[PDB]
A and B are shown apart, each in its own frame.
With several copies, the nearest count.
Chain A
Amino acid sequence: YDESAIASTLVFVRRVGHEQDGNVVTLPPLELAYQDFSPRHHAHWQPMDVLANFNAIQRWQLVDLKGEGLPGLLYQDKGAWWYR
């Protein structure tokens, strides 16, 4: 296992037997590898203007409406709701 404070994962599984003379016989190990999370070196920024006037001062929410899945933008006003 390759351990870390957050989680360990199994990396190698190897089949091995022992000989009576104090020795071993092995088969090639099976290796596994996982996706890492290293924002320290790989986080990236992207500007957006597709969100127009969205903010938390005015009546806007990021919401799971009508089918949900990825949230859309809900704008509320007096007497009406609008949605992206």
Chain B
Amino acid sequence: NNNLAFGAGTDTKTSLQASVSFADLKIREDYPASLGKIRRIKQISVTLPALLGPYQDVQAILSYGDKAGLANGCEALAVSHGMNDSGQFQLDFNDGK
């Protein structure tokens, strides 16, 4: 689950995918169990350092494998600005969604 590959889907054959296992990142190990055991993702931003100039775009989709537990559309994020961006034009953690 830690690899690069061209995708096998019908229209993904020319799409280069970068896959990473969350379990293998050893994030849990950063803090002791005394601080709580339930550790869950709030939001992921994407940075592609110095890739694009001021008027250039990147087309890329970030997605989660086990999409089944998510609300529709929460399984994927649109990367386009490339500079610590997110899946929405305006990020607001105080929103209702």
Chain A interface residues toward B at CB < 8 A: 52-53, 55, 57-58, 75, 77-82
Q: What residue of chain A has the Cβ atom nearest to residue B84's Cβ?
A: A78
Contacts of A57 in B (CB 8 A): 54
Instruction: Tell me the dominant secondary structure on chain B's binding face.
Output: loop
- As a 0/1 sequence over residues 68 to 87 of chain B, the CB contacts with chain A under 8 angstroms (1 = contact) are 00000000000001011000
Q: Are A58 and B49 in contact (CB under 8 A)?
A: no
Chain B residue numbers with a CB within 8 Å of A79 are 55, 57, 81
Count of B interface residues, CB-CB < 8 Å: 12
Query: What number of A-B contacts does a CB cutoff of 8 Å give?
Result: 30
Please pick, from A58, A77, A78, the residue contacting B53 in the complex, using a CB distance under 8 A: A58
Interface of A is mostly: loop
Q: Which residues of B contact A (CB under 8 A)?
A: 47, 49-55, 57, 81, 83-84
Choose from B49, B57, B83, B84 the contact partner of A82 (Cβ within 8 Å): B49
